[PDB]
């Protein structure tokens, strides 16, 4: 459902 518009910043 959700996309990397969750994090993605590869931490």
């Amino acid at each position: 459902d959700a996309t990397p518009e969750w994090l993605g910043a590869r931490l």
Partner: antibody, heavy 112, light 108 residues
Framework: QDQLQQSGAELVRPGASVKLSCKAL????????IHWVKQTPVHGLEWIGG????????AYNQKFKGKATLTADKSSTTAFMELSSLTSEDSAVYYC?????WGQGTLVTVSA | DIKMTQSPSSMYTSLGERVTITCKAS??????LTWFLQKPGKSPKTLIY???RLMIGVPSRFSGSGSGQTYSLTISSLEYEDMGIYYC?????????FGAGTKLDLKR
């Protein structure tokens, strides 16, 4: 699908170490960060840190830099969190999260 | 270090009632926030991500809003199932931080 499954409760001795795991299912593991959160009655929720399985990138809560080590394994889509030199202060429920999904948590009791 | 101020801290409610919970970030967090509920002895369950997008499977009576430093979670009509503690999480910047939460309580 889409899910996070954590390992069972741990009963460790002070001064020892323990390594927790978080199995990811139903989604592309190397596309989302996996973060670990600590919860205790007294201190509430505390973000420990995160890891990007796709790039091995990590970020820690300064308070845990040197205490917690986060690793990830692509072949078993499992994120790991290791804690060293444990004290009763480390007794808590530990969660892994993709920020939307949360694991069911792992209870860690530090006692002699 | 972004501080999330959640309010109210305690909520005295009645079923069917409309409930609004608020979280203010000590700085702009660009809608990178989630709302989750946690029941006693149970693990967290997300209701909203990115300030106003419903998690699949979450009932529509739950909705989120806000854009800069102020975000609200609205429960259109409280149900028994909704009791527990609500929290907000900002992930616009490390370290991720949480609001102190708000206990939802059935008034009598």
């Amino acid at each position: 699908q889409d899910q996070l499954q954590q390992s069972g409760a741990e009963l460790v001795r002070p001064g020892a170490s323990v390594k927790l795991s978080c199995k990811a299912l139903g989604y592309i593991f190397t596309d989302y960060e996996i973060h670990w959160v600590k919860q205790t009655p007294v201190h509430g929720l505390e973000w420990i840190g995160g890891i990007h399985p796709g790039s091995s990138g990590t970020a820690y809560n300064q308070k845990f830099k040197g205490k917690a080590t986060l690793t990830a394994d692509k072949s078993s889509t499992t994120a790991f969190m290791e804690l060293s030199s444990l004290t009763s202060e480390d007794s808590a429920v530990y969660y892994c999260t993709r920020k939307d999904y949360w694991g069911q948590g792992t209870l860690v009791t530090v006692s002699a | 270090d972004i501080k999330m101020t959640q309010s109210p801290s305690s909520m005295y409610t009645s079923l069917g009632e409309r409930v609004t919970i608020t979280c203010k970030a000590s700085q702009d967090i660009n809608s990178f926030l989630t709302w989750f509920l946690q029941k006693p002895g149970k693990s967290p369950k997300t209701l909203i991500y990115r300030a106003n997008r419903l998690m699949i499977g979450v009932p529509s009576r739950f909705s989120g809003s806000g854009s800069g430093q102020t975000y609200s979670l609205t429960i259109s009509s409280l149900e028994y199932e909704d009791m527990g503690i609500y929290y907000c999480l900002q992930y616009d910047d490390f370290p991720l931080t949480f609001g102190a939460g708000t206990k939802l309580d059935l008034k009598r």
